[PDB]
Copies of this chain bind each other. A is one copy, B any other.
Amino acid sequence: SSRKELANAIRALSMDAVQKAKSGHPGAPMGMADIAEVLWRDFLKHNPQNPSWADRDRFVLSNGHGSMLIYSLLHLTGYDLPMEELKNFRQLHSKTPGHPEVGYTAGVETTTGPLGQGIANAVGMAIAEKTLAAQFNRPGHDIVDHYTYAFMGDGCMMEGISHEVCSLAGTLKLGKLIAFYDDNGISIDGHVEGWFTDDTAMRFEAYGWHVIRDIDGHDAASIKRAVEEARAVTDKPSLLMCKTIIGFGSPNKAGTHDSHGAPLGDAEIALTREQLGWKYAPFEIPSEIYAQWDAKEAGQAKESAWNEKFAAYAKAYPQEAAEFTRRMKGEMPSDFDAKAKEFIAKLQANPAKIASRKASQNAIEAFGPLLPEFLGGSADLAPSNLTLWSGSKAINEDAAGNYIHYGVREFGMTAIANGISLHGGFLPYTSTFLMFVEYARNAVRMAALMKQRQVMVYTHDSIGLGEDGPTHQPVEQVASLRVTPNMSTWRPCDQVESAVAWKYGVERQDGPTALILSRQNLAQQERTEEQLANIARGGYVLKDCAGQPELIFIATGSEVELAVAAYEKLTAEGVKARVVSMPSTDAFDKQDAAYRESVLPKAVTARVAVEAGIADYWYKYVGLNGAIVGMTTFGESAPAELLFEEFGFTVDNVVAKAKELLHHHHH
């Protein structure tokens, strides 16, 4: 078959699968099919029989609405994605969801769709390859050597996150990152010139990319040459400007917004088959076309050759090879649990009244020698977020390092880190002031959706940061994280809870962990052995009374010290009180009903929550017959100690609110 005929198999499967679903996006798959045919058949290094091969090239579809493009490619090249799944595009529990999802589908590297995040993930995958190669390759033994290819469209280009990640990719000289821009002139509102007029090539050359202009994206020879030229440029990421016709093949919808995001229609599909010369019925592919598309034999040969390389590496570098395997599998060192528990126990025995940001740095320092897989960073806040430890080495200084200066790029940082976690080999941590989780908010959500391990270090968590004022002082951000499916959020009250939360985060394989950390010093609380072990249960009894309490304080973070002081005052007056420390609501909620009842007994309705954050969250635990000492407004610019007083975070106010609550219960 000709290359065009082979590309037309993608066009047919895509338009037909969209038509059967009565839903989806035929335009981009049809527009990019010729580019995909060249990339996948002539360049991509992959094995359909082992999508987890450590040294495979990575492909990312940033314009993820064009999901039938990737499903067509995976099916045609021989991945475990049968035709029946393509017939079930966009149907419940299929392996072909409307936007591609990692883990749903053999060979899908990342979950994309939200525009711009795929190219960010690709930048992270390329950072991961470069860093892993620098750490592990040895003379005569280049066990890490693979490309990262991304497809992206006008939407990804317009999004700010593309500026963040492509600027940084230029700084880091990511020569194995090769992106293809689907330059088709169309977006949902119509012809893009009304709203998008950049000289995109000039923009990317400003970032330090190698840019190939004016590629005919429907001419295989032109595409091939461009890819060869990009793979030969080793010191700059490459952008291939591919002029395409959206909906290529459709006489009436090609080149129109109408092809973007709805089925073409049966009549138009018939005309499209006639224009393309594609005779096969829907979901029909002849054996000769499979024979030309299939990648099993070549992929086997390539992976077998790599396995020989790796065996030779392991003979020469046995400990390094064992580390490579461990890290690519995402496994933890066998002695990490015991060492981390020893550190936590030492902290409990050796109080220190320090900020939880500093307790976080101390945990990084303790873990760093044990976790060479860390690839950490901050969005231009290293000296404030406290993300450097003595063993940190920035990768812009030495490519075998373990630290990234992300710059002022919170969203890009977080989505890059998603790419790092998806690549394998690393455990990323990212950091900014908590407020600016709002800049990165959907990338945080994507980490949770993709079930990725990433520790998110968010410092300066409340009005306790003081004078920078309400644009910086979080109020409602923690509550937003707490209600995010599969998110873990920890607001430790002292250096011990901080170390427990760090341990929890690095050991959490199936989703991310946000640490909510103070600027100001936090008192260490006394704990028995059981209480120390109970921190990891998310909520636990810290102070108690004999018999059923008539009042339970529930507090987090910096406010535990205040709640304990109120408990002491009330206890001295004969009130039966309890304090619950709730460092993680999500972990608490995952405990069984008996444990949760033991901490928050249903008989006790006089519950007082204390937290320098939005009050409305806490109805979940205090109900309608309690009290909340929380924030209900934005903050103010002033010294923190004056803010806590003004907003009611004082022993006198907490005691008064508790006594008022009890008075109402009594009368």
- Oligomeric state, in copies: 2
Binary contact track A81-123/B, C-beta < 8 Å → 1, others 0: 0000000001111100111010000000001111100000000
- Bound-state CA distance A642–B472 (Å) is 43
- Bound-state CA distance A486–B475 (Å) is 12
The listed residue (B94, B188, B408) touching A159 by CB distance below 8 A is B408
A99 touches B408 (CB 8 A): no
A21 interface residue (CB < 8 Å to B)? yes
The listed residue (B188, B196, B438, B631) touching A442 by CB distance below 8 A is B438
CB distance from A510 to the nearest CB of B (A): 13
Which of chain B's residues has its CB closest to A202's CB?
B206
A349 interface residue (CB < 8 Å to B)? no
Count, chain A residues at interface, CB 8 A: 113
User: Which stretch (A39-47, A133-141, A164-172, A177-185) binds chain B?
Assistant: A164-172
The listed residue (B114, B160, B207, B638) touching A409 by CB distance below 8 A is B160
A171 touches B188 (CB 8 A): no
A194 touches B90 (CB 8 A): no
**Could you list 22 A-B pairs, sorted by A, with CB under 8 Å?**
A23-B467, A92-B643, A93-B638, A97-B470, A114-B435, A160-B164, A187-B380, A189-B382, A192-B407, A194-B396, A195-B407, A198-B206, A202-B205, A203-B207, A438-B442, A438-B445, A476-B480, A479-B479, A485-B633, A485-B634, A605-B624, A623-B623
Across-interface contacts of A408 in B (CB, < 8 A): 115, 154-156, 158-159, 187
17 additional contacts, CB 8 Å, given A101-B471, A160-B161, A449-B471? A21-B467, A23-B467, A24-B467, A101-B470, A113-B469, A113-B472, A158-B380, A160-B163, A189-B380, A189-B407, A195-B405, A201-B206, A436-B442, A476-B484, A479-B479, A483-B616, A485-B631
The listed residue (B24, B93, B99) touching A471 by CB distance below 8 A is B99
A208 interface residue (CB < 8 Å to B)? yes
A441 interface residue (CB < 8 Å to B)? yes
A354 interface residue (CB < 8 Å to B)? no
A632 interface residue (CB < 8 Å to B)? yes
Across-interface contacts of A497 in B (CB, < 8 A): none
CB distance from A192 to the nearest CB of B (A): 8
Which of chain B's residues has its CB closest to A65's CB?
B468
A174 interface residue (CB < 8 Å to B)? no
- Bound-state CA distance A101–B473 (Å) is 14
A97 touches B636 (CB 8 A): yes
A162 interface residue (CB < 8 Å to B)? yes
CB distance from A428 to the nearest CB of B (A): 16
CB distance from A440 to the nearest CB of B (A): 9
Across-interface contacts of A486 in B (CB, < 8 A): 634
Q: Which of A43-96 contact B (CB under 8 A)?
A: 64, 90-94
B92 touches A380 (CB 8 A): no
A466 interface residue (CB < 8 Å to B)? yes
B188 touches A382 (CB 8 A): yes
B199 touches A206 (CB 8 A): yes
The listed residue (B156, B472, B476, B639) touching A92 by CB distance below 8 A is B639
* Interchain residue pairs A-B with the least CB separation, the first 9: A160-B160, A163-B163, A97-B637, A92-B638, A623-B624, A202-B206, A438-B442, A195-B407, A203-B206
